[PDB]
Ligand binder design. Structure first.
Ligand SMILES: O=C(O)c1ccc(Cl)cc1
Ligand SMILES: O=C(O)c1ccc(Cl)cc1
Ligand SMILES: [Ca+2]
Ligand SMILES: [Ca+2]
Lengths: 502, 502
């Protein structure tokens, strides 16, 4: 195998004087060799402070060159970085660190987080990011340290998912290589000093780390740091840095397209060859503006924290239709059945994917959730899917979102995509409410565009004119001024049911 | 890891009804699933006959769909195929089989080879290819057999090299994946049913097997069988089969270019996107006609049986200047020195390459040769090279071909490339002959174009007009009617020294 460390180490022998890490706004640029020396220096300092191989270390920080250096240093020493979203509540961050039995936590200042960890009882030693490295410059002490022995199944990195608190997925050493190289076999990246990769995806997301940061460096290219997303600024970096690939959220992509659409603009996006996204939830309209206003090859991917890439589609026409690429083996099985209970073609079931080299080895300290998701060599996505007559996979939605009305499956995502194109609608969530037949009734919760007036009659008229089969059209509308959302701007579906029942 | 078997097995789950193997001339076409069933059937028959996992089996046959099925079947059963060039002398083939302690040999009729094996004393059981499978159709008997456990360092395939008899390089299970995927990271192939790969390279060559056959199937594409090379016919297959990539010898490429150069021709080569070659020995002129007359991206690669791909160059300008790609780590060391004796930049030494996942594990039954080539984690290529001011690798020639004159290194390959452009010259070999100073004198052996008259004076005049430094120009010419060559049309350099000394 080639671990993350080995891939970076080899890259550095091949292109030592080539730019590895750029933070243009900060005027900060490091070659592959300069980056490696800084990683080595931070590793040695961390070791001298008592940190040892296979100890878990939390990382709580937003994207920056300094966190890149810290993460890779932990890995170089042989510690296991547990990368956490810093936008989570402080008490939740502290509970996950406690839960995970971490040795230490590396955190970015604004330390109501450090307070939280202390007062949780965790005993994770706090390490401030600014104490380790500042704008690429490390605080250096301690003897040089051995590059430790890493084993294929051994914990390497921990990444956190979405009922309840996020789960700590353990990524083994052997998973890194295919988690990078799918970007070559599926997305068509290739080795070379031409690679300039824009860092839009968060580092605590598996795509942000493996598919973006590691792939950039491992292919002997440049990773461009973005500390704060702004569409005009991001497109200017494409031109100025000669960016060749970008991976972004559907939401960032809609904003980037709109910014690229001005005829009075001087922006040159010619260098950009690959625009990649996880577009299962992307509406036809968003995808259309992406095709129109951004250059490069568009590639849709399906993936998970647990198993990385499982499906993709070159030059997609809709976001939900994809097929397995290199590394992947997929099935669709009876919802709630064993891994060998293949559905007849055209029937709906749960998408499952083989757990090969790229797969997590379990959820840290959560044996119960692990047994439910990893069964008999297969990862269970908890997504509903169907094989089409063309032999591709159509993603239908989450098992848990599914609505059963008159004994028939209805997927709110489909109905939401339709209703989101209706006049006056700015937001829509489709949910099932209990009927009097022991089933559920398709119900739509809609927010009006500012100043517009919605009506159940007009919305139903729009649905009747759509392609929606009769049984799918909402039986009832709730017109609301806003939807209940958590701090991560995500809709609280349970809270919504309870709200509309009274 | 993903073995050859696993890569093919996964491909077959992904594209069972897509064409895997085509022999257009024969009207023979098999899907991935049809191919897999035939592999399984041949494996089961071979097992029932007594063949077991980890036993070595020689394969002596020219490219054909049937040998593809036999090789993969042996691998499926878990036996170790030892692939042999059928153009070698029968007695030499029998000696290698004996030397290798093979359990059996699968051979293509014209069995002066079977006679040879018997009368060698080998005790390898003879298996005729035509007894196993005929035009894709297997002779089926025996119970279904288990897919055996394969381990990363365990022998998988054996491939033979070039003093003395060819050596049996043992390729481990873990080597297969990077031996395929370099075609993605270096050459820019990607996963997909668009892949149609023309099978010009021999299956008993590592490129022919890993980079061509296995890569074709593993990426869910089609392998087009070519039993006998003919330029017009090969280009017609490009058009008719919509070939996307081809890997050929410099010699085949010169012939394909010439055939493509006709303005009266109806050939459409539009589908062809990748023309790949090992061009270290390719003259500037040949490369020029390749650029002019063949479409697709041209990529030069450097590789070995022992370590697969170590250097490459996109859109090459000369054949000798390349750089390490993904997977690779390279050094240039003091000729005859330890692996850490790095040369100062611009000084000549031996190219060595790290022995990572793709590397052989040794030469079967040849511990002495193994110790010379695999030292301290490094494979020794026995090629001389130098780092250029641009930081690329320039291949200079074989260590053993090097001529020392007045204490200075001269590489005949360089002098041969120059002299091959001289009027009247059809063939040239540059050799060193003993001088009276305990060194060697640069001597050129030249064959005239049919009917042309060569002279030492005219040849020396041409050299004086070239870019050759003074010390490199031949001191002496031998004008010969032909050069001594073995049955593989290769020049016998030792035999040439002895011939011209009398
Ligand atoms: O979580 C995701 O959406 C995700 C994870 C991994 C990949 Cl490759 C793609 C998407
Ligand atoms: O033997 C060769 O020339 C050779 C072997 C392997 C590769 Cl990848 C390229 C060339
Ligand atoms: Ca309100
Ligand atoms: Ca003669």
């Amino acid at each position: 195998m080639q671990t993350v460390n080995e891939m970076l180490r080899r890259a550095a022998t091949r292109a030592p004087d080539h730019c590895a890490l750029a933070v243009p706004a900060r005027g900060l640029r490091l070659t592959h060799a300069e980056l490696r020396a800084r990683v080595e220096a931070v590793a040695a300092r961390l070791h001298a402070d008592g940190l040892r191989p296979q100890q878990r270390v939390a990382v709580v920080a937003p994207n920056s060159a300094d966190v890149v250096i810290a993460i890779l240093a932990l890995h170089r020493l042989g510690a296991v970085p547990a990368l956490l979203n810093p936008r989570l509540k402080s008490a939740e961050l502290a509970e996950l660190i406690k839960r995970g039995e971490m040795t230490a936590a590396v955190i970015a200042v604004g330390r109501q987080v450090a307070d939280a960890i202390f007062q949780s009882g965790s005993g994770a030693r706090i390490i401030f990011l600014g104490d380790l490295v500042r704008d690429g410059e490390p605080y250096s002490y301690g003897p040089p340290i051995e590059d430790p022995q890493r084993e294929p199944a051994q914990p390497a990195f921990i990444f956190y998912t979405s009922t309840g608190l996020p789960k700590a997925a353990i990524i083994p050493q052997r998973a890194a290589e295919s988690r990078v190289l799918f970007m070559s076999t599926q997305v068509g990246l290739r080795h070379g000093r031409h690679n300039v990769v824009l860092g839009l995806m968060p580092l605590y997301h598996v795509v942000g780390f493996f598919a973006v940061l590691v792939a950039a460096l491992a292919l002997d290219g440049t990773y461009v740091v973005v500390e704060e997303f702004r569409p005009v600024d991001a497109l200017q970096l494409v031109q100025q840095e000669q960016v060749t690939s970008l991976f972004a959220t559907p939401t960032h992509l809609d904003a980037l397209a709109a910014a690229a659409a001005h005829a009075g603009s001087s922006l040159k996006l010619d260098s950009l060859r690959h625009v990649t996204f996880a577009g299962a939830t992307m509406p036809d309209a968003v995808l259309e503006t992406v095709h129109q206003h951004l250059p490069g090859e568009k590639v849709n991917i399906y993936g998970t924290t647990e198993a990385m890439n499982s499906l993709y589609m070159r030059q997609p026409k809709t976001g939900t239709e994809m097929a397995p690429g290199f590394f992947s083996e997929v099935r669709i099985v009876r919802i709630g059945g064993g891994v060998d209970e293949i559905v007849a073609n055209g029937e709906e079931g749960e998408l499952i994917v083989a757990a090969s080299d790229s797969a997590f080895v379990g959820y840290l300290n959560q044996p119960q959730a692990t047994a439910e998701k990893l069964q008999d060599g297969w990862y269970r996505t908890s997504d509903v899917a169907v094989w089409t007559p063309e032999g591709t996979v159509r993603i239908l939605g989450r098992v848990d979102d599914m609505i059963i009305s008159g004994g028939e499956n209805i997927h709110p995502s489909e109905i939401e995509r339709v209703l989101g194109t209706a006049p006056g609608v700015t937001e829509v969530v489709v949910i099932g409410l209990a009927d009097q037949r022991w089933g559920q009734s398709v119900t739509a919760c809609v927010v009006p565009r500012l100043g517009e007036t919605l009506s159940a009659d007009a919305l139903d008229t729009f649905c009747r004119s759509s392609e929606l089969a009769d049984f799918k059209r909402p039986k009832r509308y709730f017109i609301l001024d806003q939807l209940p959302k958590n701090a991560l701007n995500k809709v609280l579906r349970r809270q919504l049911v309870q709200q509309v029942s009274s």
